Structure 1
Amino acid sequence: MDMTVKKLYFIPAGRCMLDHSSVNSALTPGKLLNLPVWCYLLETEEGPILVDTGMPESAVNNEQILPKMTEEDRIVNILKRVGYEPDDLLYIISSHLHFDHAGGNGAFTNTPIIVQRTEYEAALHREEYMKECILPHLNYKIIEGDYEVVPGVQLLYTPGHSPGHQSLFIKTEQSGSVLLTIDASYTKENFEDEVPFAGFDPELALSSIKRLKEVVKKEKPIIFFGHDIEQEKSCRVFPEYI
């Protein structure tokens, strides 16, 4: 039997202000949304695993897209609070390399950073990628498609929102099956109702959602969305875990 993840921690990593048309492509632009930024910490048998690394420190007190980030929201300060130094981490998982998911990746210079090849290669070329998110000499562990990280921790390839976006399917000891969509769906309605949202390839984003729905049919997991203001406040967050 595969081990489950001992603890899954949801960690607030600051916020990001966007036009409301980013959670619903049909909306008349002109209203602001203040979205939560997340990272996740997985305690496993072989060691702690961090999923995403917050915003780049150039966003600290430095707000189309307006980062709302304090010093406390820097990944190493998050790491201090959880009780680890970067080198304690078994793996870093980058769901993708957008600035609000990979901006702290430079803090981890020894830990393998799991990233999809299509994401990594896009970040080497596409304009939307900040250098903080694609530093050249980190220990990248480049994968393609679905991948088991450690027993209990699986990566589901869900491109569309970005060229190589990936989501997480986790089994925890306390909660059983958990799906973290990350940016494969910002909100429940992006997923449930297939309300269109911001992305590199919306058509591919839809098929990724359709694939996740096949997984949900079979596994019936609890699902946590990437930037969901409605779901946010009833999540148990660090120091609590699920």
Structure 2
Amino acid sequence: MTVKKLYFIPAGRCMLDHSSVNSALTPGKLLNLPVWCYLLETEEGPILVDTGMPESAVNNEGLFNGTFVEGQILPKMTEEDRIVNILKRVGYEPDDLLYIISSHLHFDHAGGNGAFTNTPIIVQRTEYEAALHREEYMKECILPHLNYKIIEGDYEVVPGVQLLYTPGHSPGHQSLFIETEQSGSVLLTIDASYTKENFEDEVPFAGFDPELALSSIKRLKEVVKKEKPIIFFGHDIEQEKSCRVFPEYI
């Protein structure tokens, strides 16, 4: 069985130093990177992958002033980029969603999680437990009373929607392998590779455990050899130019 439609939905942007996309680069040039969420229309109902940035980021590029990442990360988020507003424009309210899938709990991927207080939020155990104590996690991304559906390892959410455990960039990062009616096999690496060169050329990039990130890239490459999917990376300015985005779908 296949997903009916896979939508790429812009959810604001984020400035990062270029050394975060290629660890060999000299710090000092910021890159204005895309932030994405994905909407899957399935037989069982709509599924949202990631939830954008927290409300604290709205019109607040200096959000991380005074923290260990001051000047390194600057969110570019307007009121329109709040996930609830994105969803309402698309045609949904939070309680309409079948599942939320959190690729991981970094601030640009889980900042909107608090909006979903009934929908099960599928997240890896190792990610959830990291978010409880590691300093790179915002409180907005680990709210205590949401309906978490904690999983361990690879997982089938519904037919056509597979989660691949790809730790390294974060302790419980997961990627998506989706089968769509229009396109067949699609791999969303999410932050298992920010850019094409992180994936193809194994160019190192920001992560909790680069050695583990590399092993997850090698694992994805084995999947790619078998399945020959179309592949989309987490924060790739070049690829963004050619991506079909909402209202188009793949």
Question: Which bracket does the TM-score occupy, shorter chain normalised?
Answer: over 0.9
How far apart are 1:159 and its partner, in Å? 0.2
Name the structure 1 match of 2:195: 187
The whole-number CA distance in structure 1 between the counterparts of 2:111 and 2:27 is 27
Distance, in Å, in 1 between the alignment partners of 2:99 and 2:158 is: 10
Give deviations 1:122-170, integer Å, cap 9, x for gaps: 0011111101100000000000100000000000000000000000000
C-alpha distance in structure 2 between counterparts of 1:52 and 1:210, whole Å: 24
For 2:246 and 2:146, locate their aligned partners in 1 and report how far apart those are by CA, in whole Å: 27
Which whole-Å CA distance do the structure 2 matches of 1:162 and 1:38 have between them? Answer: 17
Unaligned runs of 5+ in 2: 61-71
Q: Report the counterpart of residue 241 of structure 1 in structure 2.
A: 249
Secondary structure of the 1:58 match is: helix
**Residues of 2 paired with 1:75 and 1:85: CA distance?**
10
Deviation at 1:193, TM superposition (A): 0.3
> For 1:194-214, what per-residue CA distance to the aligned partner results, in whole angstroms no more than 9, with x for missing partners?
000000000000000000000
Q: Deviations over 1:53-93 (max 9, x none)?
A: 0000100000x100000011100011011100000000000
Partner secondary structure for residue 22 of structure 2: coil
Q: Secondary structure at the match of 1:184?
A: coil
Query: Sequence identity of aligned pairs in percent?
Result: 100
Report runs of 4+ in structure 1 exceeding 3 Å deviation: none
2:90 corresponds, among 73, 82, 88, to 82
Superposed displacement of residue 190, structure 1: 0.1
Q: What's the secondary structure of 1:118's corresponding residue? A: helix
The whole-number CA distance in structure 2 between the counterparts of 1:71 and 1:171 is: 33
CA deviation string 1:201-231 (max 9, x = no partner) = 0000000000000000000000000000000
1:32 Cα deviation (Å)?
A: 1.0
Partner of 2:6: 8
Alignment partners' CA distance in 2, 1:200 and 1:56: 21
Q: In 2, Cα distance between the equivalents of 1:48 and 1:36?
A: 23
- Distance across 2 between alignment mates of 1:204 and 1:27: 21
| Correspondence for 1:93 | 101
Task: Provide the rounded CA distance (Å) in 1 between the counterparts of 2:235 and 2:89.
Answer: 22
Distance 2:97 2:221 in 1: 31
2:182 is paired with a residue of what secondary structure? coil
CA distance in 2, matches of 1:11, 1:131: 24
Q: Give the structure-2-normalised TM-score.
A: 0.95
* Alignment-derived partner of residue 55 in structure 1: 53
What's the TM-score once normalised by structure 1's chain length?
0.98
| Shift of residue 41, structure 1, vs aligned partner | 0.1
What is the CA RMSD across the aligned residues, in angstroms?
0.4
Cα shift at 1:233: 1.6
**SS at 1:231 equivalent:** helix
CA distance in 2, matches of 1:61, 1:28: 28
Does residue 102 (structure 1) correspond to residue 100 (structure 2)? The answer is: no
State the number of aligned residues. 239
* SS, match of residue 48 in structure 2: strand
Q: Secondary structure at the match of 1:33?
A: strand
Give the Cα–Cα distance (whole angstroms) in 1 for the partners of residues 89 and 41 of structure 2. Answer: 15
- Displacement of 1:35 after TM fit? 0.5
What is the alpha-carbon distance in structure 2 between the residues aligned to residue 165 and residue 211 of structure 1? 13
